[PDB]
Design a protein around this motif. Structure first.
Motif, PDB file in Angstrom:
ATOM      1  N   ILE B 329       1.078  -1.344  -0.053  1.00 28.12           N
ATOM      2  CA  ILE B 329       0.472  -0.114   0.268  1.00 28.12           C
ATOM      3  C   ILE B 329       0.799   1.325   0.454  1.00 28.12           C
ATOM      4  O   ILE B 329       2.015   1.260   0.021  1.00 28.12           O
ATOM      5  CB  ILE B 329      -1.004  -0.086   1.448  1.00 28.12           C
ATOM      6  CG1 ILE B 329      -1.974   1.338   0.784  1.00 28.12           C
ATOM      7  CG2 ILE B 329      -0.104  -0.117   2.287  1.00 28.12           C
ATOM      8  CD1 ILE B 329      -3.279   0.060   0.221  1.00 28.12           C
ATOM      9  N   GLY B 330       0.587   2.271  -0.342  1.00 28.89           N
ATOM     10  CA  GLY B 330       0.700   3.347  -0.537  1.00 28.89           C
ATOM     11  C   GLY B 330       0.142   5.219   0.179  1.00 28.89           C
ATOM     12  O   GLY B 330      -0.920   5.187  -0.035  1.00 28.89           O
ATOM     13  N   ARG B 331       0.955   5.119   1.377  1.00 26.35           N
ATOM     14  CA  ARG B 331       0.555   5.706   1.812  1.00 26.35           C
ATOM     15  C   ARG B 331       1.443   7.351   2.431  1.00 26.35           C
ATOM     16  O   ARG B 331       1.100   8.008   3.045  1.00 26.35           O
ATOM     17  CB  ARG B 331      -0.683   5.182   3.569  1.00 26.35           C
ATOM     18  CG  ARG B 331       0.563   4.873   4.330  1.00 26.35           C
ATOM     19  CD  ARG B 331       0.035   3.707   4.562  1.00 26.35           C
ATOM     20  NE  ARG B 331       0.893   3.152   6.313  1.00 26.35           N
ATOM     21  CZ  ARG B 331       1.410   2.234   5.980  1.00 26.35           C
ATOM     22  NH1 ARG B 331       1.943   1.690   4.769  1.00 26.35           N
ATOM     23  NH2 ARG B 331       2.358   2.368   7.011  1.00 26.35           N
ATOM     24  N   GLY B 371      -9.167   6.239   0.582  1.00 27.17           N
ATOM     25  CA  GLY B 371      -8.962   4.814   0.610  1.00 27.17           C
ATOM     26  C   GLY B 371      -8.480   3.820   0.304  1.00 27.17           C
ATOM     27  O   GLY B 371      -8.612   2.371  -0.008  1.00 27.17           O
ATOM     28  N   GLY B 372      -7.604   3.701   0.636  1.00 26.90           N
ATOM     29  CA  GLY B 372      -6.164   3.048  -0.116  1.00 26.90           C
ATOM     30  C   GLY B 372      -6.505   2.628  -1.347  1.00 26.90           C
ATOM     31  O   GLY B 372      -5.741   1.435  -1.628  1.00 26.90           O
ATOM     32  N   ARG B 375      -1.644   1.850  -4.997  1.00 30.92           N
ATOM     33  CA  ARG B 375      -0.448   0.868  -4.981  1.00 30.92           C
ATOM     34  C   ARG B 375       0.826   0.935  -5.080  1.00 30.92           C
ATOM     35  O   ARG B 375       1.050   1.668  -6.575  1.00 30.92           O
ATOM     36  CB  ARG B 375      -1.151  -0.850  -5.957  1.00 30.92           C
ATOM     37  CG  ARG B 375      -2.280  -1.316  -4.774  1.00 30.92           C
ATOM     38  CD  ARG B 375      -1.939  -1.472  -3.677  1.00 30.92           C
ATOM     39  NE  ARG B 375      -3.021  -1.680  -2.408  1.00 30.92           N
ATOM     40  CZ  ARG B 375      -4.112  -2.689  -2.112  1.00 30.92           C
ATOM     41  NH1 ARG B 375      -3.278  -3.660  -1.382  1.00 30.92           N
ATOM     42  NH2 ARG B 375      -4.865  -2.509  -1.079  1.00 30.92           N
ATOM     43  N   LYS B 393      -0.331   9.798   4.688  1.00 32.70           N
ATOM     44  CA  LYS B 393      -0.872  10.594   4.285  1.00 32.70           C
ATOM     45  C   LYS B 393      -2.257  11.094   5.214  1.00 32.70           C
ATOM     46  O   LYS B 393      -2.756  12.228   4.595  1.00 32.70           O
ATOM     47  CB  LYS B 393      -1.601   9.599   3.558  1.00 32.70           C
ATOM     48  CG  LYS B 393      -3.381   9.330   2.620  1.00 32.70           C
ATOM     49  CD  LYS B 393      -3.678   8.709   2.011  1.00 32.70           C
ATOM     50  CE  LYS B 393      -4.194   7.632   2.105  1.00 32.70           C
ATOM     51  NZ  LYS B 393      -4.800   6.455   1.974  1.00 32.70           N
TER      52      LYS B 393
END
Ligand SMILES: COc1ccc([C@H]2Sc3ccccc3N(CCN(C)C)C(=O)[C@H]2OC(C)=O)cc1
Ligand SMILES: Nc1nc2c(ncn2[C@@H]2O[C@@H]3COP(=O)(O)O[C@H]3[C@H]2O)c(=O)[nH]1
Ligand SMILES: Nc1nc2c(ncn2[C@@H]2O[C@@H]3COP(=O)(O)O[C@H]3[C@H]2O)c(=O)[nH]1
Ligand SMILES: Nc1nc2c(ncn2[C@@H]2O[C@@H]3COP(=O)(O)O[C@H]3[C@H]2O)c(=O)[nH]1
Ligand SMILES: Nc1nc2c(ncn2[C@@H]2O[C@@H]3COP(=O)(O)O[C@H]3[C@H]2O)c(=O)[nH]1
Lengths: 454, 418, 454, 450
Positions: B329-331, B371-372, B375, B393
């Protein structure tokens, strides 16, 4: 081939260069002052000096080989390492340590080892080794005592050598203060010379010690200089040992300050005596098992990756056994395992009672719990490490007959170290995985339909 | 300098060092002239010449140096003669300066010349602030105090001896610093009161020496002790939970790299002790150019950039550490403050598709997912140790609610790109 | 049958094993170096050695029988405890300490009692007892300084024995430094031998140069080594006493630092001198009555369950006295107890006035309050311990007059400790209790129309 | 009447009871050991010990009359005070101290002053007086040094008396260690006996035995015990002085530690040299003008009530000068006083720029601020102490050309200390007051046209 400074080969070379540096620092002035020490063991000193010079050249080679970190990356280019070494003052000290000054033996005689004092300029390598092994050793206080003892031994030995040199310059037996006549059958021995000079420097570096008083003004000046040098050195040693004792007693003092503050609060707030016995017993348990510091203040400086890695390596096998978190993405497992905060429960402690809010899921990392009735006399089922409960209390399930409420009483049989995951912590960790959010909602749906709680 | 500032412009520090040497002369050479007979008629002119030179230094410091000092009134720097002179006159420093030049062959007439001790304290503070490792100067200063105590004891012993010859009395002073036996035996109560007073003053000097050495050792090794205690607590925690040696060695290597490079083990705990303006201006002079270089944050409000600068957390990544895995996941937005980072391509990874040096920003598109959604489309590793400034984030979400126009513009950028 | 290592019986056995360990650590070297001490009291020494060996066997039996905390529960399985003991360095030390070396007497006569030096290897029991004593005594600093003094006495005794043995090896009366001739009627006495050795050792460790000067090289070497040992002893005593002194007034120094920070703040901000006097009197009251602890700072060192159970033991008995909280959920009362925030008021301080915001209710624990008029000198009523007011100002009753406003003037007659439950904390704790929230609103409004309001 | 233990009269009585306690703890042992001292001034010591016991009895009466803060109030009921005194160990100690052992003088003779060694049991009162002095004097370190010196002199004097007693028990002139023969006229003087005993004790404890060596075994034991006592005394003095040094310079050490930390941070982060010099200049200004620790850090130890009274004393007088807050209610005024928080600004720092969002209102207390536009050196107007800006932007005015935006650049020529009030802190404080919120909105709205 580049030797990294943070490795063990650099440590072994640091010891192997410290040994000739220590030999020089403890023997060059000794052979310079005690002429019989130089003369009688001439061949041995020549061999040891040649060995020290060879190890000095090899250390200079290692200084080129050792690699600094540039932009967080180890340098392996030869020219950059050579330039980085040569730009520093250490290269100047190394090349000054290795002037061919042993050729002055022909021009000054074999009884002048003061020409080799330039080999003392490798002190920085010895100090680098000492500060590297002070952090490396399991016992920092013991080695710091060893360093302090070695430092005062070196200083006392140097003062002994200087005292013998001054007695030689003034004249042996000329005064009651100087070293006696070396024509004596008992005082002419080199062992007696060095050992009595060491005893005299021991008596002179401390003003308390009683020695034959100085006669002329030069001896008085030297004794005053030794007095103030000993004041500086021994004040530094006592300050170092006092700082060590403060450091080793800092944890105990902080713990006792917390214990006394809680005692003062309980006496001030008129807490019942049984409860303060429970608190003091808990604190004695905490000090006995060495659990005084919580992991929140332990893993506070570590990065998110390292705290995450420790959290996997502690709780992944336990957390993946849970039914809801079985078919889950590993990233959510990493994010959730960071939020597992520990709680330690005394024996007989009620973790949750019937009629309480379910806002935390408890995972039994260590300890045994029991499902008990309202009275608590009887036990329904025992739970051991690796178990979990409160899985559905944190899950927001609509239409639950027994929602957000504990359906059983949990009693800590012993000192249970169990990690709680808050409902708000899990929902804040589920704002990044909505698919896993509805997956867990479906899992809770089937769990509640299995037991008919809808 | 028409008006010197006392803080900077170290020529004032040099003059104050000269005043300190004059005051040290008036402290040291007065009792040795009062007791010991170096104030002979053969060399009386040298003593009077140097004493008058010290008096001239005192008068010059009163007139043309202490008067033209910039002074803060109401927080405002004030740099005019008519106010600086009155501010100096109102201060206790001028009162002590006047008392230190009262003119009264006896060198005890120059006893108030030692009363200009505020200049010594000002010079001590300035020399402490100028040079790093000020504990060395603290050691030298405490040693100077102990030498002065022994010097005063030597002069008193020589004066009482009549009721070289200076180094002999000095030897007797050091020998009897914490010993009373060297002094002659007392036959009266009054004599034992002074003997006990001498012993107690010498022990006070010796214990000030020892306590200042303990203070210097503790202050010079406070950070090392704190880092060692933190490392030992982490090692005890990992040993209690049976962490394997790979993760333990990674945590250790992170500890030595953070302690050797940063020297504080946590930059954020230092910032919270600073003023908020200090925090903001330090975040500007570190990351504002790099943050403002990106095109995603261009056209945004400067206060939004400033608020993200405060929330940028510095994280050190070990060599060959996956900053963000493929499919992870990318945050976060990683800003490479130092080090090399590698985005990998090719078959089964292990081939550097591109490398990025310090000052580049990647992963900012992960800041704009809701909401995620985002990627990580490529594997990213850390080539060597690297210091990355990371903005979460969630932190951007807390920042963006205070700036509605900026949040709306950034959402338009999100809609335009993805 | 198992013994709890945290129990008082284990501490009593720690003392009962420390006594033979201390007896060995002193008297074994005392008899080894003073041969007249071993030979004269051999009948008593054999009995005491056999008693010490018996206590060593019972210590082995206890250490097999003692339990540890596995999963928070004391282990009651004998075989598990035995295998835990054997797989430890302590078992190796104990079996090395309990090797029967008294048979070596039959090889070396009765003049060699240093054969049982292995009995010194039970030092861990002594150190554990002296580490488990300071954590349970009411005088940690007094016991710490007595323990340090006894350690210094043991080291001085050991160095006295070593000096006497060195004098014996060199020969009594050979020179001035050694013990004089034992054929002398006065110096040949055993008590004189030991006490002059102890006097020499104290002059050699605690100070320097007050002993007779050495003659041969081994004597100078011993004096220098003893100087190093004694300066380490002196630095250890100074560091321990300095840390003890800093720890006894650590609270006082911290409180004085806080007072000085407050004082320089009020000097810089230029507050009125009456407010300065009130602040100084407040801090004098705070220090004099042992109230200097910060309640949140003290309670943040407790576990959440333990802190909550402290708060239950403190606030639950008086929160039940509140009219709206008399009949409520136990979880609601506990959570509202956990949200209580302490405040301390000086005498004559005004908590609230007619017109101020009724944001929080106040529950009086210690102190008496006064309801006063506009002038503030007339007394309506006095609120005693356990009283409460403002319980309706934190309730969002629809349409009621004087909404979130105080209808009375409350002042403090003396010093008052009040725990305030805020409106925000009540709403936060009531967000999981909708039925309790609406029933609290019902009770508050039924109170309001009972008194003629709304 | 009930005497307040926190009052000055309790300190005065503490001194007047400490004087007989310090008399008994030093002079009774001297009379007991030096029998010539007891025999020479028996007439003085009888009345002096009688008045000491009288002051002891009066101190017991004061202990029955001293108050304790029961339930936050100084209780004045005599029965409760008497019961509180009698339930404490202090009553047992005072009763044992006031045992009339002077009536035993008729049996053991007038040459036994050691029978009234129970008068030392009032040591707790003397220790209480010293611990109250430590929290009262303006020189705590000087008093600590004087108290330590007095304790060391008391121990030295007691050891001197014990040495004279040991010499008397062995016999004067029996050997070279004991006090010499008292029949000698030079060594028979009472003053000479006490001075020689005191000097012997000082040599034995302080110099670890420069005295002539012991001859008997009991003398060796006594000298060894005194050596241990003296090394404990020296270590106590050194540790106490080191702790005093740490307590005096802890604030300077913490400030220098944070200076070293920020210097290492700026050197490691490649912070520009001008910024680094600005930071060091700022911290030097903070240390020089005694404004180091933050206001929130300083006042967070205080209770909310006393901190509120402090803040009202400082900021409320400058808050009524605000145009919108001039005619508002007192409760909202004190809430805004507590909500505003300090901000320090070095010279050359822009507090807010043009086009910036007006998140907080700034009220200047100690500053010389200026308003500059675009160029930054225009200096349109200078605001001195008591002024304010940013009040337009915090108010959500219905219709504004610059909606929640600053209108000009603000600069500080020198160091300025000014208090900020965030818009969120104003909105949360204005929820409790609807009428005052409407009044503030109306008054702010009618000022934007000029
Ligand atoms: C003034 O110059 C001096 C320099 C060095 C000292 C030594 S002597 C010594 C020798 C052995 C044990 C202990 C000591 N003692 C205490 C002795 N008496 C006062 C109890 C010290 O103080 C030592 O100093 C340190 C700082 O360890 C003394 C004086
Ligand atoms: N009611 C009940 N709960 C159990 C039992 N065994 C384990 N538990 C767990 O105990 C937990 C207590 O809190 P919850 O009611 O949230 O969830 C409960 C279950 O997860 C059981 O036999 N009955
Ligand atoms: N996939 C890919 N990413 C790159 C490249 N160069 C830089 N990056 C950055 O590497 C980042 C990895 O995570 P993201 O997919 O969020 O965003 C990616 C980009 O910011 C590239 O050539 N290919
Ligand atoms: N006015 C008044 N208030 C009282 C009296 N007794 C108790 N109180 C309480 O004092 C409280 C002050 O705050 P509130 O106005 O909220 O509520 C008030 C009442 O609950 C009384 O006799 N008169
Ligand atoms: N535009 C403008 N504002 C000024 C001037 N002098 C003082 N100010 C104040 O500075 C304030 C900055 O914030 P605001 O824009 O809210 O309101 C501004 C004015 O109240 C001036 O000359 N021009």
């Amino acid at each position: 081939v580049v030797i990294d400074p943070s490795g063990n080969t650099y440590y072994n070379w640091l010891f192997c260069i410290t040994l000739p540096v220590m030999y020089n620092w403890t023997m060059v002035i000794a052979r310079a002052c005690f002429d019989e020490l130089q003369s009688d063991y001439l061949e041995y000193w020549l061999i040891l000096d040649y060995v020290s010079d060879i190890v000095y050249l090899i250390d200079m080679f290692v200084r080129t080989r050792t690699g600094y970190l540039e932009q967080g990356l180890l340098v392996k280019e030869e020219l950059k390492l050579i330039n980085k070494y040569k730009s520093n003052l250490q290269f100047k000290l190394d090349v000054l340590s290795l002037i061919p000054t042993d050729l002055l033996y022909f021009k000054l005689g074999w009884n002048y080892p003061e020409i080799r004092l330039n080999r003392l300029l490798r002190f920085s390598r010895m100090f680098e080794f000492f500060q590297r092994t002070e952090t490396r050793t399991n016992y920092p206080n013991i080695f710091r005592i060893s360093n302090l003892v070695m430092y005062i031994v070196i200083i006392i030995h140097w003062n002994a050598c200087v005292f013998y040199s001054i007695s030689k310059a003034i004249g042996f037996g000329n005064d009651t203060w100087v070293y006696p006549d070396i024509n004596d059958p008992e005082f002419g021995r080199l062992a007696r010379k060095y050992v009595y000079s060491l005893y005299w420097s021991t008596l002179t570096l401390t003003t308390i010690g009683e020695t034959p008083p100085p006669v002329r003004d030069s001896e008085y000046v030297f004794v005053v200089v030794d007095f103030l040098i000993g004041v500086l050195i021994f004040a530094t040693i006592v300050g170092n040992i006092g700082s060590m004792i403060s450091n080793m007693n800092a944890a105990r003092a902080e713990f006792q300050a917390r214990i006394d503050a809680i005692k003062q609060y309980m006496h001030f707030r008129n807490v019942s005596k049984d409860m303060e016995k429970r608190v003091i017993k808990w604190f004695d348990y905490l000090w006995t098992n060495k659990k005084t510091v919580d992991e929140k203040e332990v893993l506070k400086y570590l990065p998110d990756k390292l705290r995450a890695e420790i959290a996997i390596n502690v709780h992944l096998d336990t957390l993946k056994k849970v039914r809801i978190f079985a078919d889950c993405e590993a990233g959510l497992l990493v994010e959730l395992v960071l939020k597992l905060q520990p709680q330690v429960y005394s024996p007989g402690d009620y973790i949750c009672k019937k009629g309480d809010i379910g806002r935390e899921m408890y995972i039994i990392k260590e300890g045994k719990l029991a499902v008990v009735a309202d009275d608590g006399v009887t036990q329904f089922v025992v739970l051991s490490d690796g178990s979990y409960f409160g899985e559905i209390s944190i899950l927001n399930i609509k239409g639950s007959k027994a929602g957000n409420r504990r359906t059983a009483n949990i009693k800590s049989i012993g000192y249970s170290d169990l990690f709680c995951l808050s409902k708000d912590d899990l929902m804040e960790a589920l704002t990044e995985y909505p698919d896993a959010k509805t997956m867990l909602e479906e899992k809770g749906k089937q769990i509640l339909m299995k037991d008919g709680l809808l | 300098p028409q008006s010197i500032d006392p803080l900077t412009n170290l020529m004032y520090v040099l003059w104050l060092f000269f005043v300190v040497m004059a005051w040290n002369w008036n402290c040291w050479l007065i009792p040795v002239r009062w007791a010991f007979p170096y104030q002979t008629p053969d060399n009386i002119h040298h003593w009077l010449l140097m004493d008058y030179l010290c008096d001239l230094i005192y008068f010059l410091d009163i007139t043309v140096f202490q008067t033209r000092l910039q002074f803060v009134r109401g927080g405002d720097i004030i740099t005019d003669k008519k106010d600086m002179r009155n501010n100096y006159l109102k201060s206790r420093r001028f009162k002590m300066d006047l008392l230190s030049l009262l003119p009264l062959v006896n060198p005890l007439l120059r006893l108030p010349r030692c009363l200009k001790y505020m200049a010594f304290f000002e010079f001590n503070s300035r020399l402490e602030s100028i040079l790093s490792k000020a504990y060395v100067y603290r050691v030298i200063r405490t040693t100077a105090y102990l030498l002065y105590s022994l010097h005063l004891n030597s002069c008193l012993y020589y004066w009482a001896s009549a009721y070289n010859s200076y180094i002999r009395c000095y030897y007797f002073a050091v020998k009897t610093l914490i010993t009373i036996g060297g002094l002659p035996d007392p036959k009266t109560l009054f004599e034992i009161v002074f003997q006990l007073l001498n012993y107690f003053t010498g022990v006070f000097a010796f214990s000030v020496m020892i306590g200042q050495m303990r203070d210097v050792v503790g202050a010079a090794t406070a950070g090392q002790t704190y880092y060692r205690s933190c490392m030992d607590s982490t090692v005890k925690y990992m040993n209690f939970y049976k962490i394997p040696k790979s993760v333990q060695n990674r945590v250790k290597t992170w500890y030595e790299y953070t302690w050797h490079s940063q020297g504080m083990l946590d930059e954020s705990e230092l910032m919270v002790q600073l003023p908020d303006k200090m925090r903001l201006d330090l975040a500007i002079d570190v990351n504002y150019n790099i943050v403002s270089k990106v095109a995603l944050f261009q056209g945004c409000d400067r206060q939004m950039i400033f608020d993200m600068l405060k929330r940028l957390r510095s994280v050190v990544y070990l060599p060959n550490d996956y900053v963000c895995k493929k499919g992870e996941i990318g945050r976060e937005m990683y800003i490479i403050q130092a080090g090399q980072v590698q985005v990998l391509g090719g078959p089964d990874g292990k081939s550097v598709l591109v490398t990025l040096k310090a000052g580049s920003v990647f992963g900012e598109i992960s800041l704009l997912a809701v909401g995620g959604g985002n990627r990580r489309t490529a594997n990213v590793v850390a080539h060597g140790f690297t210091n990355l400034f990371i903005l979460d984030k969630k932190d951007l979400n807390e920042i963006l609610v205070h700036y509605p126009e900026s949040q709306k513009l950034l959402r338009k950028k999100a809609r335009r790109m993805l």
